[PDB]
Write a protein that binds this ligand. Structure first.
Ligand SMILES: [Zn+2]
Ligand SMILES: [Zn+2]
Lengths: 401, 400
């Protein structure tokens, strides 16, 4: 269950000292990453999110206006050009306000929900680095909701729904929740904080989610909910955040026209569910011990022959699976069937499709899993329909037989 | 009237600010086009047997000195510091791909190894030289590297050529001009090495009946290159494609593989990009089509609409059916009159707009019209989804 060990064995990624804390994603690892993105994108569509992309760097002068400069200055990478200093972004929030700022916005356009797989950089010390968990270059599944004060409650409700929806896809059911309240150094009135803390509380209570208050641990710009998941070893992983913000929009001149035809500043909600996606792949690697569910598996099916005699049956079967949209390889090497099954079991291939004479003659295929389960001979088109359904639904379970 | 800057504003594709010179903020609809272009490149990566990888945003200056590009790229690179060490923000993906190749023992059976990346790169060039999307600082090339033997060079260049013409034809670019750049004064390798490398490129083009002009002395110091230049509907030249041989970077970065005789051989590297900067290519396409993007590229492909409040439920069923077929669709159930709605999506270049009246609901049909302002009449629901699916999935330049 060591993601560094498993990552090296399965050839997912590597790290080296010429680029501390930044991942070289190999083909198979990048396949896992991309499928994770596809999954998040399907959630973004279902929950009515835009997807944008911002630039990697921005003038220090703009970062000075955010309210984050003094707190982040030591953690940012900077770079110079033509007497101007640029910060490499450690967060996507200011960039999203820049996009919001183009074109006149109305009350009609709110809530405006804006997501991004934004590659951010944080200059942490080198000794603090550790595989995929603590990295310098990271991609959060971050997003921002711009809304009215009256809309906050419904939008936190949706965020909450989206969090438990996404976590239960990977088999994470034990979730611990903390609501962090007003710090000592903060902005805004006491009744603004009363309302904001009440909206987060009521939203959790409306969904029958237990939580503990964390006194004085909120950010200066608003209160937050944090979600901590537990893996199959019962280890805690803080991942999710819903963070209200009454500072950044006004700080970066964000506005919209209300029903009463008056200029109003929108409330901002920061939300990430998985958190750092590099880290989350690390968490999944250890949760599953390298046995990634079929939909995430780099190679989903390996088709193999017993002898040279079945090679063209394997080729046709392999082409059928390519056409069905399945990540498939053909193992036509001059090796024993047991040697082929052992190698791909160790590579954690979900399904091995074995083709002997009896399978060829009947128009069938013998299905073996990486767990060692023999599901017997099955009709080829029936196996493909069942493989598709497993992938389509993102099931944790392999087929029954 | 085909300025990408104007169309990009009108269709809400992107913007740029002085706070981030030459670096694009992709809005929802612009980013949709970018990602579809990415989907298209990936289908070609699969067809032409490419791996896809992702490398780090920066690496140590000490490594960039060992590549041999330091003296040439010194002024063109963004640099940053951390813990008494200097890191260069990457202007290209070539070293990083070799670092991936250096992991795990490679043999002759692994070659040719083809490694692609949508690599986010940065170049520090004067702000006066920036022009919309055509010349930017933050760019994303459809870059790839092929690691192969000396004998395999001829076949991989052939594959690169095929991939270039295949991809340009998808967007309607048929006028292609080709240049072969030869040995400069300051260079690497023996004379017989350049005799092989130039001949490899020249013979590959000659065998394909591709006429080219020699561009004498204008190659890199580490090998010759082919350059591909396409022409838009206004007959403007855009250099996009490059196929560059490299007999230097592998050796200098300790790239090796176990040959057929069980001894360490250094592989040769083919650098290749087809679209080039994808921000720039999006720019070229925006102008080529004047915002009337082919349906597969269009940010919003279909908009379903009700004549009055009565049809509300029928629009939602039709929208869902379209969404199940894999079509980027938006229901428009506002209360602003029919012509008002049509006008708005017409001006945003939505390929198809589906009006739903009483005669259409009872008959089980839909009234289709185009962004051009052309009536296709009342047609069957399921036959329209079939027609759109073929148009989208085949990546047709033509509409119905
Ligand atoms: Zn944020
Ligand atoms: Zn290159």
């Amino acid at each position: 269950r060591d993601h560094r060990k498993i990552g090296k064995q399965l050839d997912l990624y590597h790290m080296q000292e010429e680029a501390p804390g930044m991942v070289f994603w190999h083909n198979d690892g990048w396949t896992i990453f991309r499928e994770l993105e596809v999954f998040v994108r399907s959630k973004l569509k279902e929950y009515q999110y835009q997807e944008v992309k911002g630039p990697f760097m921005m003038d220090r002068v703009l970062w000075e206006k955010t309210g984050h400069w003094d707190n982040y200055k030591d953690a940012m990478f900077t770079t110079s050009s033509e007497n101007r200093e640029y910060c490499i972004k450690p967060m996507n929030c200011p960039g999203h306000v820049q996009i919001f700022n183009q074109g006149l916005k109305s009350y009609r356009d709110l809530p405006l929900r804006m997501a991004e797989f934004g590659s951010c950089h944080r200059n942490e010390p080198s000794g603090a680095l550790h595989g995929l968990m603590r990295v310098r270059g990271f991609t959060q599944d971050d997003a921002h909701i711009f809304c009215t004060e009256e809309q906050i409650r419904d939008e936190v409700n949706a965020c909450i729904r989206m969090v438990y929806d996404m976590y239960s896809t990977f088999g994470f059911e034990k979730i611990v929740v903390k609501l962090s309240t007003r710090p000592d150094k903060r902005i805004g009135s006491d009744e603004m904080w009363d309302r904001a803390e009440a909206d987060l509380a009521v939203a959790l209570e409306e969904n029958n989610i237990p939580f503990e208050y964390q006194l004085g641990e909120g950010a200066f710009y608003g209160p937050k909910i944090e979600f901590t998941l537990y893996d199959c070893l019962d280890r805690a992983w803080q991942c999710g955040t819903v963070q209200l913000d009454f500072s950044l929009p006004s700080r970066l001149s964000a506005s919209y026209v209300g029903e009463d035809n008056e200029r109003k500043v929108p409330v901002m909600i920061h939300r990430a569910i998985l958190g750092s996606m590099e880290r989350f792949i690390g968490i999944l690697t250890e949760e599953f011990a390298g046995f990634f569910p079929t939909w995430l598996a780099p190679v989903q099916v390996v088709v193999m022959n017993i002898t040279d005699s079945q090679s063209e049956y394997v080729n046709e079967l392999t082409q059928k699976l390519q056409n069905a949209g399945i990540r498939v390889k053909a193992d036509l090497r001059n090796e024993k069937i047991g040697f082929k099954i052992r190698e791909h079991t160790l590579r954690r291939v979900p399904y091995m499709l074995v083709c002997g004479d009896k399978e060829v003659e009947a128009g069938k295929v013998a299905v073996r899993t990486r767990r060692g389960k023999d599901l017997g001979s099955l009709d080829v088109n029936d196996v493909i329909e069942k493989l598709q359904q497993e992938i389509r639904s993102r099931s944790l379970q392999q087929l029954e037989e």
